[model samples]
Structures are given as C-alpha cells and as structure tokens.
Target: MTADLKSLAKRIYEAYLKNFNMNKVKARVILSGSNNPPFVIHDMETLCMAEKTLVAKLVANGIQNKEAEVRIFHCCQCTSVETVTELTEFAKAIPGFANLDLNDQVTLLKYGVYEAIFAMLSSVMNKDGMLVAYGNGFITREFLKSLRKPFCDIMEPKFDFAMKFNALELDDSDISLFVAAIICCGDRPGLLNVGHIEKMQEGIVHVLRLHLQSNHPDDIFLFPKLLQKMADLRQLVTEHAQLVQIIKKTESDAALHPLLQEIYRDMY
Candidate 1:
C-alpha cells in the first residue's frame, strides 16, 4: 500500500513537473510582473509608501478621493487574475481531468481553481506576512493591514486562511496530490459524468490520505485537517466572490480582468 501510494504520488509529481503552472506563477502571484511596475508590488519601500499613503489618504480625503484605494485595486486584480490563469494551465495536467467532457473539465477547473490557489498560497504566506519578488522581499502582515478599507478587507481572510494552513506543514510533494484531488472533485453541481469523476476523485483522495499518513507518522490527523481546510476554503471563496463583485461594481476604474470574470462569474 505504501508503494502503491508512492506510484500515485509519482503520477502527481509528474503532472506537476510537466504542467503545473505554479512553477512559473510562483505561489500564485507573489508579486506579479504583469500590468506595470506600480500596479505590481515587489519592493518593501514600495509597499511602505503605499501603506503610508493609503492610511494617510483615508484620513485626509475621508474615503472619497481614493487615489490610494484605486492603486491597491489595480495591484490586487492582476495578482488574482494571474494566479487563476496559472490554475487554468495546471488543470490540463491533472491525471484523468483532461479525459472528462470538455464542458465538465471547464466547470471543475472554474470551481476548483480558487481552492487550489489558496492551498498553494499557504506555502508562501503566514500570519506574519507573505513572500514577494522571488521571495527576496518580505512584507509584514502589519503593512498589509494598513491599506484603505476595501483592499484591507479583501486580503485579511486570505491571510487568515494561509496562517491556518501553513501549520499542516506539508511540503510541495503533499500539496501536489492535494491540489490534484481538489481539481478532480466530482461533488460540484452540474457535473455531467458524476460517477466517473467521483471514482477518479476517490482514487486521488485515497492516495493523498496514504501519502500523508506515510509521510507524517507523527501526526495521524494531518489528512483530516487538510480536508477541513478544503471545507474552509469553500466558505472563503463564496464570500470572496461577493467581495470581488463589490470591488468590480464600486471601482469602475479598476475593473476585473476577463480571466477573473470567467471564474468569478461562473461561481456567481
């Protein structure tokens, strides 16, 4: 059974190595390169200035001018859109995922991408801060919390989720299988071939269970704990979608990307 799990784990690593977009996306937008330099934050000094002006702008203009707010929105939008794009690229490599109906495959990728993104984010972030710019820059959680109203609000939950998830301490090898399981979940509504997907999902989940158990003997409960994080991500994304729509509706200047619309609109 251990070797059996090993073979399945090999399949997962193979899929990730050959096709997972996280390799280049690098933990899902840890300082994106798209758009422009100002729209993407990578330097501590930049984050510092943004944080200072952000708090100062709120105090001075009373949330109406929103110069700082709009910039933050621009920064946030690119990161999420880029990360979701990585998910799209990674979905093609998930074992058995490409075999499903094309429509079914899209549906699963749309719904599951958020879960996988946040799961991947846990590796780079924690209660204190997250990695940025190839991990050369580290922004404190305090700096992130100092932003204007909406920008500050949207990120805290993600930080909270990341902080909790990092505790599981499962490395990339474990996460590869976990994300594979996430991408293949058949429980989503409107799935066309439910039985086939369920069987595939089951096999992935069981392999994940065995892999975790065998890898981390000190903690017998790591598998169940990771599942709960999945459940938590479920709650997190629903609220996140509404919050994002609010960002979309309120900030006309900072409209969401089309990639974001595909995922957010489907979930909406």
Candidate 2:
C-alpha cells in the first residue's frame, strides 16, 4: 500500500505538471510541508500535501520565488479539534510563511486552504489503513501537488494494522480490520476507551444507514473501500461543487457500462 500511495502521488504530480499554467506568477498556491516543493501550475484551486520534513523547502521557495504569489497551508493529524488552527498558525509562523507580500497575503485571506485539508487526509485513510492505492490517480496527484509537499506520515499503528490485515484472511466485509487499526495506534488508544468505542459504533451505524440509503451505493460492509471512496469523493465535492458534478457525471456514465455493473454486482 505504501508503494501504491507513493506511485499514485507521483502519477498525480506528473499529471498536474502537464496541465499547470507555469506562466501565472500570482496563481493562488496552497502547500503542505516537506523538503521538496510539490506545487506546479496544475495545482491551483486544487489541494496537495508533502513529506513533513520538506516543509522548509516549500516555505523557502514560496518566500524566495517572489515572482509568484504563494500561500502556504498545513495539514495535521491527531484528531484534536484544534488541529486546524494550530497547523495554520504554525505555517504562518514560519519566517517566510509568517510574513508574506501583499498579493500572497490576499491569496491566503481569500481562501484559506486549511478548511479543505481534510480531503488529503481522506486519501491517506482507512481509519485503520491509509489509502495507498488510487481510485482516480490523476485527481489524487493534483491534490498532492496543490499542497506542494508530501503532507502525511505512515504512523506505526496504521502500518502495523495493515501488515496484520494483509497477512490475515481478511474477508470483504471485515470492518473490524479498519477499526482494529485505529485501536492499535498507541497514540490513539482512546479508540479502545468505552466512550470513544460507543461513539465509533454510533458513527459506523450512521455510515451504514447513509450507505444503504442510496439505491446503488456499494454494500459497504463487504467492500468498505467503497465507503472510503464515497468518503473521498464527498470530501472533494464538499470543497468544490464542480468536483461533485464531475463525480456524479463520471459515476453515472460508468454505471451505464456493463462491465461496471458487473463489478458493482461483485462488490455487493
């Protein structure tokens, strides 16, 4: 899965470069932190993230490359309610990030990327495993490019859960695998706390209700990845109405194809 995410992220970045407008100096930029800069022209109005370590590179580039007005944003984990404010403040606190030129400041003010940071988080998520594979490879890549860095980390608990899951005879319906990963994370041990557990249970039930509510929604219990995909699309569309339209159109068109219908049948 690690390899898959890496490949997917790389592929998306390549695609972003292909369509990005290198000429737009003041193009709005949103970046995740890392040593390398991931922003290319194609990332505008989209989202992206990078390696946590490469944050300095991105900040420096945004600061030094005064030709373009760049705005930086940070993505955070640790289910803390304050994560957004904290990460955004941290990004702004960086020497260059904390201080920006007028155009860059306007870009940051008009649209703060922190609100949509959750989208990238959804991509690298399984609740127990980060989505390492691609549902829409190019789209995923653009998301990363927008962040201008590799924003997420594969924490040990998630990795450990995935290793065990891959080795086990995990049936399609096993949400336990996902929950198990969340529980095993030493940092999120509250996953085992009774109160949290009940909250989780209630959340799962609500998700199941929503999934079943749709006539053609995938049987989430069996192919929980379907739920993950739905969640991913929901995140994207929530950020961009055009994305919702695109997803609905693509899905509707795909459903008309017999091969897709067969796949849906198999999933259910």
Candidate 3:
C-alpha cells in the first residue's frame, strides 16, 4: 500500500509541476540585508491597490486598533483564509486528490493546509520579512513579536523556520514536491483510510528526497533536514490550532470566515 501510494504521489507531483507554473502566480523582488529597504515591487499599481485595500479593511480614517491581540487575531484569520483558499485550489488541480472520498478530501485539507502553507511560505518570504496577500503587505519579525503573547509565539518560530528553509534556496520544482508531500499526509486524525494516505505521503517524500539529492549533491543533509522540518510544521500548526481555539473564546470568534470555521470544526 505504501509503495503504491508513494508511486501515485510522485506521479501526481511531477504532473502538477509540469502542468502548473507557480512562478507565474506573482513575482516580487524580496530584498534582505543589513537594513530592510523600502519598495521593490513587481507592480507598483498592484502593490498600491493591495496596500490600500488591506489598510481600509483593518483601519478606518486615521484611527486603527492599537491592541496587538485584536490585530493579530484578525491577521491570523485573514492569512488563514488566503492560505487555505490557495491550498484548496492547488489540491483540486492535483490529478488524483479529487477522486478521494469527499470526506477524505476535506479531512486531508483540514489537517494538511497549514503545513502546506508553511512549505510554500518561502516563496513569499525574505530573510527580513514576508509578503502577505501577494505582496500587499510586508510583515517584519519585530512587528510579529510585538503582538500579544501566544500570537507572537505562534508566528515567530515559523519565521525562524522559513529563514532556515529559504536558505536551502529551493526552486519552484522543489517547492511543488514539498507541498505535495505535506498535502497527502495520511497521519491526520480522522482520516478515512490512514494507511492509504500514508502511502501517498510516503510517495511524495520519496520523490522530494530524490530531487534534493539530485539538485543538492553537495548538501548531504538536505533530504533529512527537510523531513525534520515537516515534523516541525506539524507542531507549529498544532500550536496555531490551539491559538485559534483561544481566539474563538473571544469576541473575535465571530470574525472568523465560514470556511476557516469549517476547517477548524472538522479538524477537532
């Protein structure tokens, strides 16, 4: 079962990479170094519109919420929507994913979306900060840390992980395999057929490992290093879930989008 699933996973990933081009999604020049500079954009008009739109969404007039807890809570909801929507679209396009039981598809996405989001995080991340909403906003580590306790805790480690993972300098092909591995995860609780999913996930891992070996011959540790980070992603998303649950206990609970609300409900 494992071998068959892995084989299917690898074929799907390869087909996805061949048919889809993530590089075309949006291109932005991410700058990093001693001092984070201002404004290197792929499209100034797009950036301006995004910046304006999000600002309007989060602020009114000159008055904006000063509470980091509130802001961070909304931020998580917003980002989660963006990430999950993108993940869903990507998953739907994968050859065999939609053929799974509708319940199985939902189950995989509920548990796997966050990990997939982080796996693709580097595409929008620089050493200094990350681009949100397709370069609508640039978020700094300092700004994230200034957010209230658990929110800060939830994001900072992810930034740390992104920095290290980005250091690998993987191309789109590598990212495709990495995200596929995260998505086919059989280990998510409540999965309809855990054994089958695990095999599928194993297939993706196998191809990813092979790609790293071929592409990063000098870096013997790259394959295992990436596998360890998958473990890290699982932990990070667990903490994120806990934080979301806490946020739900607050007034902000109503602020969550219906789609994300569904994902969380399905997860537990």
Number of the top TM-score candidate: 1
Model 1 scores worst on lDDT over the 10 consecutive residues at: 33-42
**lDDT per residue, candidate 1, 123-236, as tens digits?**
767566776433444556676677666767877888888877777777777888888888888888678999989988887888899889888999999998988888888888
Counting clashing residue pairs in each candidate, in order, gives 0, 19, 1
lDDT of 2 by residue, 64-85 (tens): 4321112221212212223333
Off by over 4 Å in 2: 1-187, 190-193, 213-223, 226-268
lDDT of 3 by residue, 70-101 (tens): 65466667777876766776776454577788
- Estimated TM-score per prediction? 0.79, 0.22, 0.75
- Cα lDDT of candidate 3 equals 0.67
In model 3, which range of ten residues has the least summed lDDT? 32-41
> Candidate 1 versus the native: TM-score?
0.79
Ranking by TM-score: 1, 3, 2
